[PDB]
C-alpha cells in the first residue's frame, strides 16, 4: 500500500494505489483506498483493510450526524479528533494508517493518523509500505504554494515510485482533488502498467468438462 | 406454613454451615438468632431484591439440648 497527500495553494490532493495483497499474492486489483468521510473531507487508508474501511465508515456516519445537526460543513479537526480518540482507545489493536484530507472554513488541512492515535498536521504525508519512496519523491520535489496540476503531478509521481519500487503496492493510480469550490474524485487518473496480450487462446470448447449429474431449476421470472 | 418453610430452610442451612466452618453444633440461641436476622430483613435495609417486604407471619418455638442443657426459645414475626 502507498497512500499520499499534499496541500496545494487552494486545496488538497490525495493519492493512492489500487492493489490489495493477501500474503504475497495480489488478491485484488482496482481496489479503492480513497474513502468518503464527508463531501469536503476524504481520507486514504492503509494497514488492515477492514479496520480502515470500518473506521472510515463509522467516522463518516458520525460526521454526517454532526453536520446535519450543526447545519454547517464538518471541519477536518473534528474528523482527526474522532479518529485519534477511537484509535487511542483501541490501543493500536485496530490497525489503520490514515491520510486525512479535507477543506473547511479554516482552509485546507492534511492530517496523518497512525494506528495508536498519533496525529500530525503536515504539508505532505505518506503511509503504507511505499511511504518511504513516496516521501523520497515528496522531499525531493515538494514546494510551497503549488498549483493544482503541479500537485497532481507530484502525487502521481510519488504513488508511481511507490508502485514500482515496493512489492506490496502496484496497480492503477488514483487521485482525489478537494478544493473549496469543488471536488474531483479521480478513479484511475493513470494506468502505469497493464496486463500483456495473451498470445495463445485456451478457451475450452463445450464438452471439455465431464459432468456426473445436473439439475436445472427454472426461476419464475415475474 | 410457607414462610415457616422458608425460615426452617434458613435454620437448617445455617446449622450445616456452622458444622462445615467450625466442626461443632450450634446452640439453640444462635440458631434462633440466625433465623431472627432473616426475619428482621422485612425492613428492607439491605438492597437485595429477594427479601419479602412483608414481615414473616409466623412464630417459631426452638427446642434443643445444647451445652447449657435443654433450652426452649420463642421467635415472633418481629424477629425478637
Amino acid at each position: 500500500t502507498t497512500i499520499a497527500g499534499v496541500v496545494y495553494k487552494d486545496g488538497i490532493v490525495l493519492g493512492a494505489d489500487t492493489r490489495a495483497t493477501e500474503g504475497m499474492v495480489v488478491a485484488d486489483k482496482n481496489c479503492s483506498k480513497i474513502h468518503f468521510i464527508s463531501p469536503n473531507i476524504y481520507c486514504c487508508g492503509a494497514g488492515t483493510a477492514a479496520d480502515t474501511d470500518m473506521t472510515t465508515q463509522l467516522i463518516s456516519s458520525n460526521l454526517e450526524l454532526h453536520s446535519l445537526s450543526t447545519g454547517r460543513l464538518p471541519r477536518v479537526v473534528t474528523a482527526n479528533r474522532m479518529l485519534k480518540q477511537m484509535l487511542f482507545r483501541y490501543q493500536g489493536y485496530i490497525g489503520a494508517a490514515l491520510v486525512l484530507g479535507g477543506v473547511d472554513v479554516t482552509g485546507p488541512h492534511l492530517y496523518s493518523i497512525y494506528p495508536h492515535g498519533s496525529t500530525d498536521k503536515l504539508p505532505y504525508v505518506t503511509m503504507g509500505s511505499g511511504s518511504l519512496a513516496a516521501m523520497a519523491v515528496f522531499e525531493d520535489k515538494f514546494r510551497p504554494d503549488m498549483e493544482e496540476e503541479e500537485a497532481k503531478n507530484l502525487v502521481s509521481e510519488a504513488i508511481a515510485a511507490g508502485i514500482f519500487n515496493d512489492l506490496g503496492s502496484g496497480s492503477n493510480i488514483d487521485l482525489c482533488v478537494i478544493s473549496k469550490n469543488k471536488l474531483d474524485f479521480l478513479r484511475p487518473y493513470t494506468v502505469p502498467n497493464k496486463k500483456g496480450t495473451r498470445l495463445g487462446r485456451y478457451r475450452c470448447e463445450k464438452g471439455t468438462t465431464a459432468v456426473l449429474t445436473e439439475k436445472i431449476t427454472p426461476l419464475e421470472i415475474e | 406454613i410457607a414462610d415457616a418453610k422458608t425460615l426452617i430452610d434458613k435454620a437448617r442451612v445455617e446449622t450445616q454451615n456452622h458444622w462445615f466452618t467450625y466442626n461443632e453444633t450450634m446452640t439453640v440461641e444462635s440458631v434462633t438468632q440466625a433465623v431472627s436476622n432473616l426475619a428482621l430483613q422485612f425492613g428492607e435495609e439491605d438492597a437485595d431484591p429477594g427479601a419479602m417486604s412483608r414481615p414473616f407471619g409466623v412464630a417459631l418455638l426452638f427446642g434443643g439440648v445444647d451445652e447449657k442443657g435443654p433450652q426452649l426459645f420463642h421467635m415472633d414475626p418481629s424477629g425478637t
Partner: protein, 202 residues
C-alpha cells in the same frame, strides 16, 4: 526526543526538538512537542506520541473547565498535579515524560517534571527525553542562577543543539517558547540559526 525547560525570574523558557521517529525512519521531522495546555501553561512532550497527545488534550480539557468554573487563571502546580494523577494511575499502560512549565501570578514562573512512572518534581531547569542524557553535563556546568530571558533562550538552544547532534532520535529544528506574564513568544531555530559546535576535524 529532547525536551528542556529552564526557569528565569518572571517566566519560563521551553525548548524541544522537532524529530519524531518510527524505528530509524523520521516519520515527521517538523513535529511540535511544545503544546499549550492553557494560555500561559505549556507542556513539553516526550515519550510515546499517542500517549502524550491524549494526556495533553485531556489535561487541557480539565484545566480549562477548572479555570472557567473558578474564574481565575489556572496554576502550573495544578496542571502538573493533573498530569501526575493521570500518568501514575496509568503508569503501566502509559509511556510519557512531560515537563510542565508556565507562569501563574501566585508563584511566578514554574517548571515541573513528570518522568515516567508518575511523580512530580519542581526543578530550576528540567531536561527529558532520550537526548537529555547527553546534555546533563552541559546543563549542570552551564546553568547559573538568575539568568536573563535571552540568556536562558541561548542556553536552551545550545543544549538542545548538542543533544540533537549526539542523538539520532533527536533532530530537526529547535522550537523555543518563552512564557511569562506578558504572554507566549514562540520561535523556531532552523539551519544556520541552530547553534553549531566544532568537530574534532583531525
Amino acid at each position: 526526543t529532547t525536551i528542556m525547560a529552564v526557569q528565569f525570574d518572571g517566566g519560563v523558557v521551553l525548548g524541544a526538538d522537532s524529530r519524531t521517529t518510527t524505528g530509524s525512519y523520521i516519520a515527521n521531522r517538523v513535529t511540535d512537542k511544545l503544546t499549550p495546555i492553557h494560555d500561559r501553561i505549556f507542556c513539553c512532550r516526550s515519550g510515546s506520541a499517542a500517549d502524550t497527545q491524549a494526556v495533553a488534550d485531556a489535561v487541557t480539557y480539565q484545566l480549562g473547565f477548572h479555570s472557567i468554573e473558578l474564574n481565575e487563571p489556572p496554576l502550573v502546580h495544578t496542571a502538573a498535579s493533573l498530569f501526575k494523577e493521570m500518568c501514575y494511575r496509568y503508569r503501566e499502560d502509559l509511556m510519557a515524560g512531560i515537563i510542565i512549565a508556565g507562569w501563574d501570578p501566585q508563584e511566578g514562573g514554574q517548571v515541573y517534571s513528570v518522568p515516567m512512572g508518575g511523580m512530580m518534581v519542581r526543578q530550576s531547569f528540567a531536561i527529558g527525553g532520550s537526548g537529555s542524557s547527553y546534555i546533563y553535563g552541559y546543563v549542570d556546568a552551564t546553568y547559573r542562577e538568575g539568568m536573563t530571558k535571552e540568556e536562558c533562550l541561548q542556553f536552551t538552544a545550545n543544549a538542545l543543539a548538542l543533544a540533537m547532534e549526539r542523538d539520532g532520535s533527536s533532530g530537526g529544528v529547535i522550537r523555543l517558547a518563552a512564557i511569562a506574564e506578558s504572554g507566549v513568544e514562540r520561535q523556531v531555530l532552523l539551519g544556520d540559526q541552530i547553534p553549531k559546535f566544532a568537530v574534532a576535524t583531525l
